[PDB]
Amino acid sequence: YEIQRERIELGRCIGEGQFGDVHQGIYMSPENPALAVAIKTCKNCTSDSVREKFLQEALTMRQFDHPHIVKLIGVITENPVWIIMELCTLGELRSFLQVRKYSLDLASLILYAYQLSTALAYLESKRFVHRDIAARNVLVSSNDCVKLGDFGLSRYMEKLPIKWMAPESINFRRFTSASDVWMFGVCMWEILMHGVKPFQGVKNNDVIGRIENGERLPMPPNCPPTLYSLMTKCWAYDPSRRPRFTELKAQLSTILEEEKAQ
Numbered sequence: 001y002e003i004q005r006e007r008i009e010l011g012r013c014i015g016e017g018q019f020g021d022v023h024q025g026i027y028m029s030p031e032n033p034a035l036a037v038a039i040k041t042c043k044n045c046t047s048d049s050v051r052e053k054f055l056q057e058a059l060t061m062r063q064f065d066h067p068h069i070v071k072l073i074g075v076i077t078e079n080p081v082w083i084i085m086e087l088c089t090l091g092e093l094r095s096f097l098q099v100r101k102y103s104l105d106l107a108s109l110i111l112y113a114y115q116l117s118t119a120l121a122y123l124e125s126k127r128f129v130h131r132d133i134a135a136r137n138v139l140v141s142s143n144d145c146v147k148l149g150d151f152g153l154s155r156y157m158e159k160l161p162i163k164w165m166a167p168e169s170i171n172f173r174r175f176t177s178a179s180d181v182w183m184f185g186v187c188m189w190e191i192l193m194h195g196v197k198p199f200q201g202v203k204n205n206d207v208i209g210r211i212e213n214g215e216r217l218p219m220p221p222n223c224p225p226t227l228y229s230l231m232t233k234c235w236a237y238d239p240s241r242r243p244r245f246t247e248l249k250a251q252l253s254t255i256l257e258e259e260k261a262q
């Protein structure tokens, strides 16, 4: 997927990544329409080390192709090293949700959860374990199209997302499709909470002991009990008792149609 700077146009910085600033911009191939794209840059990439860690995200994404998973489009492996990928115009799901709280309908909330479950159903069919499913890792493409990102797992380098992680992940570093379901459960909770973080105001160490106590994130105000009951299953302490995505995906569809026609 090698590209050439000659066809890329750097625009406004859109945020800082783990390796460098991220700029939005556009890629343009001649008789081909110009397409918006994000350009991840890496300031310390002259260092072989840092580069390997930076480009790894592209190698990973190079294996996927799903409508709800941020797409890789190319990479400029020479220098300065850049990774070019699809542009999600509306930003991160957390902000988008906090800003459109009193403006987004419930059905759109469930629809986002559903679209994410489809992307995850797909990764589970490829036996891929993401490891960090969280609202903060979801980009918004349109009012009715969410996408999953952060395959480079920015939060596991060197920050430990204890409050999103499955117990076995914290306690034993065990990451499996089942732990991804536990996380997706918290992510559903965030979406419904309009981008508020889980267990805010609770010390990690404390969240852990609470889970083992059977306590779980409370039901989001105005959350259909059917949806919360589905989150509660994603949070079964015993990983084997957690549902898989083919099933989450089928129930979210149901629940979505019920919130639609109602």
Ligand SMILES: COc1cc(Nc2ncc3ccn(-c4ccccn4)c3n2)cc(OC)c1OC
Pocket (backbone or CB within 6 Å): 014, 015, 016, 017, 022, 024, 037, 038, 040, 070, 085, 086, 087, 088, 089, 090, 091, 092, 095, 139, 149
């Ligand atoms: C940083 O969140 C944003 C992302 C996007 N677009 C977007 N599209 C593709 C990618 C790929 C990576 N990122 C990204 C952004 C910041 C930090 C790390 N990655 C991406 N972000 C657009 C934004 O402007 C509204 C934006 O600010 C809210």
